[PDB]
Coordinates of C-alpha atoms and ligand atoms in Angstrom, one line a residue:
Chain A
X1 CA -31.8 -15.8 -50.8
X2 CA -29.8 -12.7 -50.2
X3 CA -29.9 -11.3 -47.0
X4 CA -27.7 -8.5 -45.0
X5 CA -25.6 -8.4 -42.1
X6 CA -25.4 -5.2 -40.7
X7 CA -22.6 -4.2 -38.3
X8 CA -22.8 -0.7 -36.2
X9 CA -25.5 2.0 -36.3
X10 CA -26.9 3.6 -39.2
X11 CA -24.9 7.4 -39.6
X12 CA -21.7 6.5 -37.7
X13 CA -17.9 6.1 -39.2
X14 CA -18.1 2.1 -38.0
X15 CA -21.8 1.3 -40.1
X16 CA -20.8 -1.3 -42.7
X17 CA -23.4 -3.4 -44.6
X18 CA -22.6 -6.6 -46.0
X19 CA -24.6 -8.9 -48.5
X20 CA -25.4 -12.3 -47.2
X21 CA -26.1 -15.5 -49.8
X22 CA -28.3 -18.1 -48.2
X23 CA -26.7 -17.0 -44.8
X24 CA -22.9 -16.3 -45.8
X25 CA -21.2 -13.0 -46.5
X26 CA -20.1 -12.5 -50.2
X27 CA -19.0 -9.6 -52.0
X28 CA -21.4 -7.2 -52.9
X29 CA -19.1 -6.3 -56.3
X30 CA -17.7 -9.6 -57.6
X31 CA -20.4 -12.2 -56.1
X32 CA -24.0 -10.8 -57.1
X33 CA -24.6 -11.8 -60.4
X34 CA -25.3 -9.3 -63.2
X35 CA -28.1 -11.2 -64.7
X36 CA -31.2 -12.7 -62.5
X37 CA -32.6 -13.6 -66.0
X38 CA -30.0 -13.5 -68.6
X39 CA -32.5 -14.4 -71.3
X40 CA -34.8 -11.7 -70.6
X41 CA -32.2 -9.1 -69.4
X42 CA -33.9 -9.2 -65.9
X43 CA -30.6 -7.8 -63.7
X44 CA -29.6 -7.6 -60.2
X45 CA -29.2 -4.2 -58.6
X46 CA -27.5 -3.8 -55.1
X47 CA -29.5 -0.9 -53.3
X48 CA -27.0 1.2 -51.6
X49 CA -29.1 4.7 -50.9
X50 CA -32.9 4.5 -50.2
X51 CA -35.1 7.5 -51.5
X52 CA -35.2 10.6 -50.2
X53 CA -32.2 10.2 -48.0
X54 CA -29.0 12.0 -47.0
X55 CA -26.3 9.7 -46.3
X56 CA -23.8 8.6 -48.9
X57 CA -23.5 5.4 -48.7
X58 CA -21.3 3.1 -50.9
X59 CA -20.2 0.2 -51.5
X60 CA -16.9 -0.2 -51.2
X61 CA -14.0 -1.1 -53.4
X62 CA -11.1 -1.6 -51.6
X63 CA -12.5 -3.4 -48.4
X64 CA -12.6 -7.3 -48.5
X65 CA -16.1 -8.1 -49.7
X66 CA -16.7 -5.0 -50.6
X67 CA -19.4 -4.4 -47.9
X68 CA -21.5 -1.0 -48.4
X69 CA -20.1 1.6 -46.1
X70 CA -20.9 5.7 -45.7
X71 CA -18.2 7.8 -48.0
X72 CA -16.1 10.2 -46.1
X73 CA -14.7 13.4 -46.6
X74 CA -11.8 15.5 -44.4
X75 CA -12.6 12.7 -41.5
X76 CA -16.1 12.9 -41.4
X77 CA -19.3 11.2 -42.6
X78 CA -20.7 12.4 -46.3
X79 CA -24.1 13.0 -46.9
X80 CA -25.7 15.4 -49.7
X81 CA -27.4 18.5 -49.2
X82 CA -30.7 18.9 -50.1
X83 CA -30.8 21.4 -53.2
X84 CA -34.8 22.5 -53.5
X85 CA -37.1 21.0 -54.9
X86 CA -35.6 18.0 -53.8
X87 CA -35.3 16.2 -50.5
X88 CA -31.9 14.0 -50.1
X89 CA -32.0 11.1 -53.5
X90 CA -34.9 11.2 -55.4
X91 CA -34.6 7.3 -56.2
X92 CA -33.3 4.4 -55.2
X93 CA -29.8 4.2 -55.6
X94 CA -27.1 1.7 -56.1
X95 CA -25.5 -0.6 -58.7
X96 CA -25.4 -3.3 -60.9
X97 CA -22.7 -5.9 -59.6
X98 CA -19.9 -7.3 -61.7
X99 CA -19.6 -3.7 -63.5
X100 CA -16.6 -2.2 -64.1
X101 CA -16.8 2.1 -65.7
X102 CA -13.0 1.0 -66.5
X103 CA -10.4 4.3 -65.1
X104 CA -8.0 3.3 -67.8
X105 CA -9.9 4.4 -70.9
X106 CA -11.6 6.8 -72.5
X107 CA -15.2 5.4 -73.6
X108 CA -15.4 7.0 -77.0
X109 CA -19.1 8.6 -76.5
X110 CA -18.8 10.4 -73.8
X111 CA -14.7 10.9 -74.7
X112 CA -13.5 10.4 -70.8
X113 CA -12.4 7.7 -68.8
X114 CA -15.2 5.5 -66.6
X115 CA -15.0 7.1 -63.0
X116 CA -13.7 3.6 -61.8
X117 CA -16.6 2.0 -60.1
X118 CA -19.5 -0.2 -60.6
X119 CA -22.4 0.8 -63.2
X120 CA -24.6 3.2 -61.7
X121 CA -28.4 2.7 -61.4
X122 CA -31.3 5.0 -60.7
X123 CA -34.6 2.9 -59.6
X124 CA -37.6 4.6 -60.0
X125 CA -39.8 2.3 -58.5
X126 CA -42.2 3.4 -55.7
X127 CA -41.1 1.7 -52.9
X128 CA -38.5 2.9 -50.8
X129 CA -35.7 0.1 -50.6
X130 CA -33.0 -0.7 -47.8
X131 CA -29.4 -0.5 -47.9
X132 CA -27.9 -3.4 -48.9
X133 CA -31.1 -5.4 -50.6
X134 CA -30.8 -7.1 -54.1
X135 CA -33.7 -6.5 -56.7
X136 CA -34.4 -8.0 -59.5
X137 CA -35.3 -5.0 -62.2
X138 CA -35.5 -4.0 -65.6
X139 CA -33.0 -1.1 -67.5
X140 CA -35.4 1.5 -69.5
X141 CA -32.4 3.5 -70.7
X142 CA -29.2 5.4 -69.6
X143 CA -27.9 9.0 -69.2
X144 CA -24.6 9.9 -69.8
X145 CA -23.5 11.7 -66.7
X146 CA -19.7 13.1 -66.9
X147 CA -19.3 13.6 -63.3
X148 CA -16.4 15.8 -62.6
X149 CA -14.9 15.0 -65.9
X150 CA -15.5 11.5 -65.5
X151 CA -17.9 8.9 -67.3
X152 CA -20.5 7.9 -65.1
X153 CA -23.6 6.4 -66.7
X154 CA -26.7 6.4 -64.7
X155 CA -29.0 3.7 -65.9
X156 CA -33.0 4.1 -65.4
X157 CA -34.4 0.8 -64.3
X158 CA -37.7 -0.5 -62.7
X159 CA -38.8 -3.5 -59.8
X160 CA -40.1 -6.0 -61.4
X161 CA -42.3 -6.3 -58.8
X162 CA -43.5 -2.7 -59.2
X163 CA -47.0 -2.2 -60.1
X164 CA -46.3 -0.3 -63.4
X165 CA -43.4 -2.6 -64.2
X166 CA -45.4 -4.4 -66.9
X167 CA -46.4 -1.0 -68.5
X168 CA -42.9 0.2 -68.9
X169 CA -40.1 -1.0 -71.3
X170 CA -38.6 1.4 -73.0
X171 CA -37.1 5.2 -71.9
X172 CA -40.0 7.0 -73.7
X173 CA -42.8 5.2 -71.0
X174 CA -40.9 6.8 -68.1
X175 CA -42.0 10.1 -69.1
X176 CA -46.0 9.0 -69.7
X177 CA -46.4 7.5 -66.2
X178 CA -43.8 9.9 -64.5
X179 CA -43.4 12.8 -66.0
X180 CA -40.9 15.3 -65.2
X181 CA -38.8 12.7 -63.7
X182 CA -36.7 12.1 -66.3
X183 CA -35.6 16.6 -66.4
X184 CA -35.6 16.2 -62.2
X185 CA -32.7 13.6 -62.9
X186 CA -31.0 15.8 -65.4
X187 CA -31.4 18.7 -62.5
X188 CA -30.6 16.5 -60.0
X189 CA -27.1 14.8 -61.4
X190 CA -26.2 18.3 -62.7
X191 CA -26.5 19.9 -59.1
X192 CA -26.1 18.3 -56.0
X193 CA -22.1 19.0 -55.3
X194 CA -22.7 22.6 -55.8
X195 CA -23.9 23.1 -52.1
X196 CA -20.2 21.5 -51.7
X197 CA -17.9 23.5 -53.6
X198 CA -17.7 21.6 -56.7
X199 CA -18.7 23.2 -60.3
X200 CA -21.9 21.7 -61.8
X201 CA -22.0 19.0 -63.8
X202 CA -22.6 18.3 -67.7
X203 CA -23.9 15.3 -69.1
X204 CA -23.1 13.8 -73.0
X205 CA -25.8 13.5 -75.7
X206 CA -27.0 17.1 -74.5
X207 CA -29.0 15.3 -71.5
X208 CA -30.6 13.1 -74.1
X209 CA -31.9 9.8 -72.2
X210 CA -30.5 6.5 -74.4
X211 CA -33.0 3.5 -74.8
X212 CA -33.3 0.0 -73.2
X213 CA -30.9 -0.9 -76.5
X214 CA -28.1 2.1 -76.4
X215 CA -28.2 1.2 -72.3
X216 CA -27.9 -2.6 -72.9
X217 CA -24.9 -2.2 -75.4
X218 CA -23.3 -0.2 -72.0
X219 CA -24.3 -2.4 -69.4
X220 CA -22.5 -5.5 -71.5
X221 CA -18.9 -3.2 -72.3
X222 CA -18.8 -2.5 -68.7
X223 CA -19.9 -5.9 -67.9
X224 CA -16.5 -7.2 -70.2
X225 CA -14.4 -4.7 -68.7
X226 CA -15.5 -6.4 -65.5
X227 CA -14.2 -9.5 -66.7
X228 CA -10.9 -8.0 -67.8
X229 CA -10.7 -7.1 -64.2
X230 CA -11.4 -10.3 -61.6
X231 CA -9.4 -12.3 -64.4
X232 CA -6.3 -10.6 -63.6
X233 CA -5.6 -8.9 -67.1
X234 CA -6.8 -5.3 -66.2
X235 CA -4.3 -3.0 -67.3
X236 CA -4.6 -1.3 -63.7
X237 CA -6.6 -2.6 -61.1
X238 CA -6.1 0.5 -58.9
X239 CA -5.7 -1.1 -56.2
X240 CA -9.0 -2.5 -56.2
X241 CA -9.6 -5.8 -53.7
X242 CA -10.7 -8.7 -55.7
X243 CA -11.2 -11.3 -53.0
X244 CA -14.7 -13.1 -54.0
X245 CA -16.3 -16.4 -52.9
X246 CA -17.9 -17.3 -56.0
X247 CA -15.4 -17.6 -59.1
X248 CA -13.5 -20.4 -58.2
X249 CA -11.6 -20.0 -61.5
X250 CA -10.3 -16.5 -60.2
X251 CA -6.6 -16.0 -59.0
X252 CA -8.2 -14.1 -56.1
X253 CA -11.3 -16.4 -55.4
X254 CA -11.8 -17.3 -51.7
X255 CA -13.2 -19.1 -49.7
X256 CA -12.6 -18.6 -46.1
X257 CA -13.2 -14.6 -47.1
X258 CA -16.5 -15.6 -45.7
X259 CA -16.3 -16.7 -42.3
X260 CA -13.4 -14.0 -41.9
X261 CA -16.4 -11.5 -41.8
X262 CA -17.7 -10.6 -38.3
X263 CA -21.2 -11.3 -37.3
X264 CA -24.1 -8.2 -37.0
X265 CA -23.9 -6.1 -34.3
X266 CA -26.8 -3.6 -35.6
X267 CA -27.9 -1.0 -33.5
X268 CA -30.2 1.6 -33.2
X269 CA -29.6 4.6 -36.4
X270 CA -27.7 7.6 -34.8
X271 CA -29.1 11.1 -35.5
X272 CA -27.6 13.1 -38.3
X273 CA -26.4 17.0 -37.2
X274 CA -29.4 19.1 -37.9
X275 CA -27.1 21.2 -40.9
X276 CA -28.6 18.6 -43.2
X277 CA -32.0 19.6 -42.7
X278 CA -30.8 22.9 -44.6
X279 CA -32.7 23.2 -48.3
X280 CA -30.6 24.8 -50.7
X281 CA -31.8 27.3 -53.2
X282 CA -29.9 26.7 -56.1
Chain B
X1 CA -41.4 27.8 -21.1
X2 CA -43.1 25.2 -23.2
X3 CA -42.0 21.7 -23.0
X4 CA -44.4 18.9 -24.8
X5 CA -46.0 15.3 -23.2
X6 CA -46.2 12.8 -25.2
X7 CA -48.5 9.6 -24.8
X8 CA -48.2 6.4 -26.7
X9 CA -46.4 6.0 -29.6
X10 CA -46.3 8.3 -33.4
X11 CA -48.3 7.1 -35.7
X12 CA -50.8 5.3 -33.7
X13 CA -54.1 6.0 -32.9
X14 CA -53.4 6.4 -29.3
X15 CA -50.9 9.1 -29.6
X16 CA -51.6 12.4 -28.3
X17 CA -48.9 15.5 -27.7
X18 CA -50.0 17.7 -25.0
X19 CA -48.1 21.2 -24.8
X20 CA -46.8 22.3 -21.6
X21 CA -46.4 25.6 -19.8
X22 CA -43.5 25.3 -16.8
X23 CA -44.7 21.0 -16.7
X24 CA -48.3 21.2 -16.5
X25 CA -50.8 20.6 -19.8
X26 CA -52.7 23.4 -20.5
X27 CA -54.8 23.9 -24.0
X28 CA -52.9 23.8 -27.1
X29 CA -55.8 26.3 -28.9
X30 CA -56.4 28.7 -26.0
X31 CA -54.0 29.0 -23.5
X32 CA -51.1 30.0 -25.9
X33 CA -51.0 34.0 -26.7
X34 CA -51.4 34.7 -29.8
X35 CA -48.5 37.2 -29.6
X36 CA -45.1 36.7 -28.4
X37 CA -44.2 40.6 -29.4
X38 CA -47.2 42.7 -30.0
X39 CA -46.0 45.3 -31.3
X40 CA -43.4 43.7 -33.4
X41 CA -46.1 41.2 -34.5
X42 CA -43.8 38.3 -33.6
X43 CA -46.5 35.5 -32.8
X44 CA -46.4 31.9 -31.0
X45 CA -46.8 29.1 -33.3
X46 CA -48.2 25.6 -32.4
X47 CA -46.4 23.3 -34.6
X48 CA -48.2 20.0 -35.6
X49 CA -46.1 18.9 -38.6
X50 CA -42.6 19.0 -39.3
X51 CA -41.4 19.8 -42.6
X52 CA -40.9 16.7 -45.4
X53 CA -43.5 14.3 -43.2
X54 CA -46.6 13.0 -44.0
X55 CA -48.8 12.1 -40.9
X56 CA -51.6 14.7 -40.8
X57 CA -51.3 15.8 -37.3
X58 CA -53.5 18.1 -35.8
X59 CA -54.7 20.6 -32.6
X60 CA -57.7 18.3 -31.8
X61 CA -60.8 20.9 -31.4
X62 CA -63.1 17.9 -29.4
X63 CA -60.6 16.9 -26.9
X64 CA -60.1 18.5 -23.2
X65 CA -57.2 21.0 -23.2
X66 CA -56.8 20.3 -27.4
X67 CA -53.6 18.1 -27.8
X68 CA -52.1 17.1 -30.8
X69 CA -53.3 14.1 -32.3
X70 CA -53.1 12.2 -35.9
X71 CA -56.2 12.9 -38.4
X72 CA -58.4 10.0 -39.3
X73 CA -60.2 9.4 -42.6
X74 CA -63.0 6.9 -42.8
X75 CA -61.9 4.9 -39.7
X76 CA -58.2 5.1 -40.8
X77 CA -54.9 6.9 -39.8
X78 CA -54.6 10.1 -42.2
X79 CA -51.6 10.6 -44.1
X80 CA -50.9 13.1 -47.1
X81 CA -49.8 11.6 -50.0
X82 CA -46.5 12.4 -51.9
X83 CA -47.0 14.6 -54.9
X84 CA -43.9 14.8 -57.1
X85 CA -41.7 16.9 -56.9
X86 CA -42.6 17.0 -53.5
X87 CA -41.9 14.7 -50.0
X88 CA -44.8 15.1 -47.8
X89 CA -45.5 18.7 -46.4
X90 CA -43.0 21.1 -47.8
X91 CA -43.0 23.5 -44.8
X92 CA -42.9 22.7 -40.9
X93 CA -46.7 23.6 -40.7
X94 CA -48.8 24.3 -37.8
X95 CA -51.6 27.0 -36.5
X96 CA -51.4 30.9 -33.9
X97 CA -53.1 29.4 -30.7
X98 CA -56.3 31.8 -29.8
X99 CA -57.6 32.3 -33.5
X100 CA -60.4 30.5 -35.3
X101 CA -61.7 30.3 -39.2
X102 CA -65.7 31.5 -38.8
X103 CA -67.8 28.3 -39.6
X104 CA -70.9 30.3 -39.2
X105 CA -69.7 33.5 -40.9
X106 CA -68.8 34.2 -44.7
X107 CA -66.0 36.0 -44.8
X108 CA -66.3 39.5 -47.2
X109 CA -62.6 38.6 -48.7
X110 CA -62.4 34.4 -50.6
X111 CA -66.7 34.3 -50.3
X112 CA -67.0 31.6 -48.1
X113 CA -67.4 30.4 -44.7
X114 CA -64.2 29.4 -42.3
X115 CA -63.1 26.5 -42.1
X116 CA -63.7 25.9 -38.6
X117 CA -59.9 26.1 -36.7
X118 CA -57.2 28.1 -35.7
X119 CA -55.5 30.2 -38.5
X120 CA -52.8 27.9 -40.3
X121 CA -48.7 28.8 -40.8
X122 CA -46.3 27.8 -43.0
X123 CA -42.9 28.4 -41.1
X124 CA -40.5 28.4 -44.0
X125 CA -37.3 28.2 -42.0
X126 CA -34.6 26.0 -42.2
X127 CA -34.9 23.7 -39.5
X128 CA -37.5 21.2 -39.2
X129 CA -39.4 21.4 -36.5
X130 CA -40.7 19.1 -34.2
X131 CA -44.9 18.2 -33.2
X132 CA -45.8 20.5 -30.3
X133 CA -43.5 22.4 -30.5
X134 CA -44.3 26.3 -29.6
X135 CA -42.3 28.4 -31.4
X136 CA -41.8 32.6 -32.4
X137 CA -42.4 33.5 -35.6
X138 CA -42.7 36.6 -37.8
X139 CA -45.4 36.8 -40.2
X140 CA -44.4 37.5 -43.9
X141 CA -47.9 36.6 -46.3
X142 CA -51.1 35.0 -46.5
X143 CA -52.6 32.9 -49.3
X144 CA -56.1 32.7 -49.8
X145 CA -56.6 29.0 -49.9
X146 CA -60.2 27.9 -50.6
X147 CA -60.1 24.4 -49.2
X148 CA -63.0 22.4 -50.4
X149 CA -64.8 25.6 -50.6
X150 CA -64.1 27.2 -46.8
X151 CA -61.9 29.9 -45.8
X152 CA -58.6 28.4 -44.9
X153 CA -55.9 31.5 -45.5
X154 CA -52.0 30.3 -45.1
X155 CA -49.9 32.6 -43.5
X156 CA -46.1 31.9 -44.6
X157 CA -43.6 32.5 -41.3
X158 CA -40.1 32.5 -40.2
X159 CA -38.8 31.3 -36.8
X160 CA -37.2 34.4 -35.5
X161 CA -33.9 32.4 -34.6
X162 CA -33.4 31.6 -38.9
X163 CA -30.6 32.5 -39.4
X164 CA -32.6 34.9 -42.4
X165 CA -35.0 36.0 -40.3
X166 CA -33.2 39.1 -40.1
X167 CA -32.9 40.1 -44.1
X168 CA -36.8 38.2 -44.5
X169 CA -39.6 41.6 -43.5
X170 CA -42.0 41.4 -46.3
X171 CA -43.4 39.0 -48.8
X172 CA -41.1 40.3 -51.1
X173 CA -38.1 38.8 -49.6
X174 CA -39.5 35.2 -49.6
X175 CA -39.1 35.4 -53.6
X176 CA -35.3 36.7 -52.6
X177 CA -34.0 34.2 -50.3
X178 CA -36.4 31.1 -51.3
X179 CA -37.1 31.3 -55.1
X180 CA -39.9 29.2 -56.2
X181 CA -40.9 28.2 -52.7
X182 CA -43.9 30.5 -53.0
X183 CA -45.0 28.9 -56.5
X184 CA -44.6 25.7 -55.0
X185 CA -46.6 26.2 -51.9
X186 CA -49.3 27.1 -54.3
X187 CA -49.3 23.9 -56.4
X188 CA -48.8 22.3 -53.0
X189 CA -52.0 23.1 -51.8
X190 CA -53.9 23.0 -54.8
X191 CA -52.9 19.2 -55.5
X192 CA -52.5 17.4 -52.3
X193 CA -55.5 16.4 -51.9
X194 CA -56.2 14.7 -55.6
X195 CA -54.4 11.6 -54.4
X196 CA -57.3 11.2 -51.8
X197 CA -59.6 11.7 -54.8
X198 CA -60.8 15.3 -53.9
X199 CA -60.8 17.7 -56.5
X200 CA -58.3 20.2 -57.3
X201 CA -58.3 23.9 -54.4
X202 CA -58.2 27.2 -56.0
X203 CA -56.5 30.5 -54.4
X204 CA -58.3 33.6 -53.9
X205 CA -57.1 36.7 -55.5
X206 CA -55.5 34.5 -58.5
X207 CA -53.4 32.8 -55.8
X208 CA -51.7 36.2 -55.0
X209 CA -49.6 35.3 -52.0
X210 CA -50.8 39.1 -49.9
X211 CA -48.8 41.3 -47.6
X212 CA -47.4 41.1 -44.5
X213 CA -49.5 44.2 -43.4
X214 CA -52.7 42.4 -45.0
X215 CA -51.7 39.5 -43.1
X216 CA -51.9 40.9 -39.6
X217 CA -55.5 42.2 -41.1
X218 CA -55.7 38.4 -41.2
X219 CA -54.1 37.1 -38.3
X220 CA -56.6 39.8 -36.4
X221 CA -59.4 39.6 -37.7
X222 CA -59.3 35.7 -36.7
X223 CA -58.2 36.2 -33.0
X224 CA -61.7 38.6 -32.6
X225 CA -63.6 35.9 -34.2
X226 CA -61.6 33.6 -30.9
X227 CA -62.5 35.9 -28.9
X228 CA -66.3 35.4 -29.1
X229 CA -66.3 32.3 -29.7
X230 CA -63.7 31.8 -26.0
X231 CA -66.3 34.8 -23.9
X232 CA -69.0 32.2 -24.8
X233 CA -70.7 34.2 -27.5
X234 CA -70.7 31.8 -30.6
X235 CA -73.6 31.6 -32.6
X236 CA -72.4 28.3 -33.0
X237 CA -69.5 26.8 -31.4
X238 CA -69.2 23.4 -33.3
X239 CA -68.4 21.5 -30.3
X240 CA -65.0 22.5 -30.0
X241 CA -64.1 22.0 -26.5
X242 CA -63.2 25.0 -25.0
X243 CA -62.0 24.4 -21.7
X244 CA -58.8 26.2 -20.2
X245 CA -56.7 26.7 -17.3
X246 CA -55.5 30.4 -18.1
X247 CA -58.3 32.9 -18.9
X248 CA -60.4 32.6 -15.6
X249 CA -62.8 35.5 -17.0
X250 CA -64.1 33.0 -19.5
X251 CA -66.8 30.3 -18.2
X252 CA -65.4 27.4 -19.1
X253 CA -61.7 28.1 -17.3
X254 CA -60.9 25.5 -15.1
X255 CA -57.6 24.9 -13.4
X256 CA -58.1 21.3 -12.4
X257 CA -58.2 20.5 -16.2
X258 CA -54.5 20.1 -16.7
X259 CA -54.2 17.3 -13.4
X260 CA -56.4 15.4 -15.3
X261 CA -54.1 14.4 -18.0
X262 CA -52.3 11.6 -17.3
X263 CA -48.3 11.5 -17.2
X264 CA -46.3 11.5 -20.6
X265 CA -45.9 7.8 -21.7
X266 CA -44.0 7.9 -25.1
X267 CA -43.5 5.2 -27.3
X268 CA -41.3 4.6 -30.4
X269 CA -42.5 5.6 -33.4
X270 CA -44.6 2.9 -35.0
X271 CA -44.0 1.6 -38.5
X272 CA -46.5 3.3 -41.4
X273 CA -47.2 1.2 -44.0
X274 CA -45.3 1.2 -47.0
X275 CA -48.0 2.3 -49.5
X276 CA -46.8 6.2 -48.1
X277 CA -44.1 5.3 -50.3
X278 CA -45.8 6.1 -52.8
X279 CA -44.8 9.5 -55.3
X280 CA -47.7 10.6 -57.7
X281 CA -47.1 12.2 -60.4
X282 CA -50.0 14.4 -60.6
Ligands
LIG301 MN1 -18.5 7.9 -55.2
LIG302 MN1 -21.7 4.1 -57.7
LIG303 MN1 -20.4 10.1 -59.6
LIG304 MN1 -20.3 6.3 -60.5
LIG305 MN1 -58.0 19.5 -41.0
LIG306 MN1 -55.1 23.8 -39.3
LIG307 MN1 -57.7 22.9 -45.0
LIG308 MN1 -57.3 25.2 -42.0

């Protein structure tokens, strides 16, 4: 049973969310494991941004336990703009724990090195999730966002416990039960820093969506760069905290990490500035 | 100046927003001038919906003094459902106070009899609004929606404080500042109701979104139609409660009215069930 432990209010600098096992903080990167069902190919994905919402939260990297926290920039809270037809995410957003797009090479298909975070999922299901909840889903496929010159894979996956989720196994069924979806997350991905002063994005295999086998083949290199990494042989770790409470054969394992964390203190969401109501036409 | 009382909580079934002038309740549908500017045909808009929400709220015709309360379909809350690309209602949306859609008449224009309630607005601005809130607007367009086969035009507006109000004086100019929002509003209306399992609305005139001078035509024609139906001269008034506390020459004023509603008693917004969630793909 995973759980969360929320500490501030929603939309403030202090808001950090961190991922509870049976009652006991562990770190959302390192101590969620990749596979729910290994056999199957049934993974766990840490929900960071529900749909259709603005703030950009994250989970972060270089805090201990690498609780999920709202990105930052010049000082102040990130959110996205809204960029019409769409209204904040348009799915669930998070990552795959244990991931690593590795900083220090060049993946060869997309010919740029990984943007130095988790793998990045999109979940399509139709429920909303929370920040900070594990799901069990299944990948469809993967697009090959380069995100400001960087790789940054965005794999389409499905709850298991979504009502079409036994109907859809492969990329080419996203587009007969939700179609347009699939050219919205091309828009989207390509877009959405615009309204922020950054050039507009491109993406590898001329937006072509890879299936369940191209994406598995990525989630396991990035799953073994992963390895490279809490093992201690990474090239450069980039400073990247690798305290865990869960891999005991780990130079950095933990315990203790866990009782270090401060209890919840959740309280009521503050308001986001009305400026993020704007809709962008671009 | 025009404050709002709410009772209850949103999205329950005992929530009502009555709309104040200088603290006491007067009726949402009669006692708000059309106009705010005559002759710069800058009206006063009753807004029941914000933009990118879903509970159908609405200027209730039956109830003393009209306040805003939430739809109801067969015994349950009403909510629209979320048709992708969109997130609930894609425009703050509301009604002009002192106008009313002909039920007994059908009009020469979309061949059809009105729909039975004040003319409806789409304020396009960029800030959403909030439920009861009265607010000055400039007319732009009307679409000639035939909803369910009755007369229910759509007049697109700007709150004079957008910061485009200014460059926005036509139709025209919606297409300039907003591209797309006009096809959009268009499929909006046509589709929204399919979830539901209604059929599909068409648009007069091909769906040709009409002038701003054709508009006031509109807007006019509408606040005559009031006009009768207010003196007392209806052939049929439809039960719409018309009782008032500002035009003493009409029979059924009746200062008295606005004591009788009790004191604002707002409670947090109530949870709506998850199934809202939802995005069709229609
Ligand atoms: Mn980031
Ligand atoms: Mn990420
Ligand atoms: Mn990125
Ligand atoms: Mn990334
Ligand atoms: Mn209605
Ligand atoms: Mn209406
Ligand atoms: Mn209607
Ligand atoms: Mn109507």
């Amino acid at each position: 049973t995973y759980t969360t432990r929320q500490i501030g209010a929603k939309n403030t600098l202090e808001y950090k969310v961190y991922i509870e096992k049976d009652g006991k903080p562990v770190s959302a990167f390192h101590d969620i494991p990749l596979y729910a069902d290994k056999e199957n190919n049934i993974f766990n994905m840490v929900v960071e941004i529900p749909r259709w919402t603005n703030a950009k939260l994250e989970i972060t990297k270089e805090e201990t336990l690498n609780p999920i926290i709202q990105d930052t920039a010049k000082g102040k809270l990130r959110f996205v703009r809204n960029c019409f037809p769409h209204h904040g995410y348009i799915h669930n957003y998070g990552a795959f724990p244990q991931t690593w797009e590795d900083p220090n090479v060049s993946h060869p298909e997309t010919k740029a090195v990984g943007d130095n975070d988790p793998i990045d999922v999109l979940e399509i299901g139709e429920t909303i999730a929370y920040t900070g909840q594990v799901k069990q889903v299944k990948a469809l496929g993967i697009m090959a966002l380069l995100d400001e010159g960087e790789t940054d894979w965005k794999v389409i996956a499905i709850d298991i416990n979504d009502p079409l989720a036994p109907k859809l196994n492969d990329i080419e069924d996203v587009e007969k039960y939700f179609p347009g979806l699939l050219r919205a997350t091309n828009e989207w991905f390509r877009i959405y820093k615009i309204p922020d002063g950054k050039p507009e994005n491109q993406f590898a295999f001329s937006g072509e969506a890879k299936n369940k086998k191209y994406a598995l083949d990525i989630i396991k290199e990035t799953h073994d760069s992963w390895k490279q990494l809490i093992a201690g042989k990474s090239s450069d770790s980039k400073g990247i905290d690798l305290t865990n409470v869960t891999l005991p054969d780990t130079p950095t394992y933990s315990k203790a990490a866990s009782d270090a964390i401060p209890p919840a203190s959740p309280k009521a969401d503050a308001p986001i500035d009305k400026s993020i109501d704007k809709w962008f036409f671009i």
